[PDB]
């Protein structure tokens, strides 16, 4: 475990992390992708190697002896807000325990649903909030990795008013 457990958030790519494994925002079928999903096929190809998974859940595969924790969220343009608010809290619970089953003590994990899965709708609280709902019960040091100037003011904002 990490020695004081925290949230911090950085806006750069998530495929120049400095923790000791990644979440991908990765479709269902393991494909290369875009946003996210592609700059980590570039990064860690061998990565994909059997990663297809359902909607709702995590699948990790090792590149070399770094962990890709591939988390499949809800595309908000093919599920009901209802259904797809599950799936969303969903894959993060499976983040959870893949992230406590490895033994890391810092992961870098993105907002799943958020981009292109967003449905065209502002999601940065809802996907944050199921984000800590899962996390906080680990003791992992957690980097979460934007891209948007006000979304990691946002995101700071979230983190330093639960102190
Ligand atoms: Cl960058
Ligand atoms: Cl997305
Ligand atoms: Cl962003």
Redesign the pocket.
Known sequence: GAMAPSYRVKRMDIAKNDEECVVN?ANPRGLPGD??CKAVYKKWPESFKNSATPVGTAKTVMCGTYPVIHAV?P?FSNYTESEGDRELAAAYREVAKEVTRLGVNSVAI?????????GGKDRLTQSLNHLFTAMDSTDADVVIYCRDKEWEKKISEAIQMRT
């Open positions: 925002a946003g996210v969220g595309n993105p907002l799943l649903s958020t981009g292109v899965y967003s």
